[PDB]
Design a binder for this molecule. Structure first.
Ligand SMILES: O=c1cc(-c2ccc(O)c(O)c2)oc2cc(Cl)cc(O)c12
Ligand SMILES: O=c1cc(-c2ccc(O)c(O)c2)oc2cc(Cl)cc(O)c12
Ligand code: NA
Ligand code: NA
Lengths: 115, 116, 116, 115
């Protein structure tokens, strides 16, 4: 599993469950092309987005649909979504976890990249 | 000042100085049209991007060029940039401060929104 | 102003107003002696805690009373308080801004340290 | 496992490995009494701190020794340590994860409390 996404809710102190996540890969024409997507699980995680074969070097965007999450909880939010944009780099073996910690008017994102 | 951007460096405990910032507004055809740009000052702040007249309702994107900032400090960071996307002024004019706290493999961002 | 505290509310996107803050300094006997206290203003800021003369070298603790803040907004939060512990002025006087960004089950804190 | 601690490094994009963590429980005399401790693993985690039997309601402090972590990496830090103080509350079955994301001049902590 070369790419995993984990989303946490700082208001409820819980995983952020059933959050839509869309991954895009930058194309040669510099547009964003759909790459993978899903909804976070009961543990706030989304696994199985891609494979080592498909996840080649390039620029990727992970879009987390935070606004719909806050709306569905009856809470007013600031952002349309959280976007995480990064270059995948081969530099020996690699696994990427994109984590996000959500509040209505703030989010934090970190990358945990391990071998 | 209806839109201000403040950027801090969590490695040095300092304002993040000379960080490029580009603001876009979603157009009627769903494209991101350039709206304003600038660079943070020695206080980590960017003022004067727009005016209450210009800053109409819409969906805005604030792109903060974090990668260039880190590379200049000798660090190869994770993110290309930090992007903040939000609807503004849809209940009338507000003042927005977009703050970002930067680390090489993480950032946070928060909005402070006040009613003048 | 050598020590300032700024507190923001990540639920409302606003300054965190009326938050109690207590500052302590570690004494020669390793106890935490009260040093200064106050409450954040309508801008979320607390100024005037100390002076360059009073704010000598030492280990300081800034306790921010986040639990009371949230309970007053109807929220039962996780943390009792947010505590920020740091050595100050050990290379001469500096100006410290201690910032905190609050959510019911999370907080962050960062320091901005400048040399006057 | 009613209490777990997870520590991440925002400078290296990695778990924070071999970080000392001390847990205290507030005593009747309002002093902090040592409760459990350990060092984070290669995954930045510390498991096995306590048991359901021992982890009764009360006020707890988790102290993460961030200064020694940054010093050992050759990096100058701001804080002496990060402290997380909370009340454990029985309210049906519960598991507490105390997570921290570390930078030299900033840290973020969140609680993930699940059943
Ligand atoms: O404290 C945190 C904890 C975690 C976290 C990340 C992955 C996990 O499996 C987990 O249990 C917790 O991610 C964060 C991610 C961010 Cl961006 C900020 C944080 O403070 C945290
Ligand atoms: O601690 C912080 C402090 C500030 C901050 C500091 C000074 C300001 O005038 C302001 O508007 C914001 O912004 C943050 C912004 C974020 Cl996203 C996270 C933080 O921890 C902070
Ligand atoms: Na409207
Ligand atoms: Na000294």
């Amino acid at each position: 599993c070369p790419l995993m996404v984990k989303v946490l809710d700082a208001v409820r102190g819980s995983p952020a469950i059933n959050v839509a996540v869309h991954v895009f890969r930058k194309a040669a024409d510099d547009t964003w092309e759909p790459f993978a997507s899903g909804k976070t699980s009961e543990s706030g995680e989304l696994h199985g987005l891609t494979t080592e074969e498909e996840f080649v070097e390039g620029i990727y965007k992970v879009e987390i649909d935070t606004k719909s999450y806050w709306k569905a909880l009856g809470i007013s939010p600031f952002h349309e979504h959280a976007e995480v944009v990064f270059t995948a780099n081969d530099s020996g073996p690699r696994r990427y976890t994109i984590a996000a910690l959500l509040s209505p008017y703030s989010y934090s994102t970190t990358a945990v990249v391990t071998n």
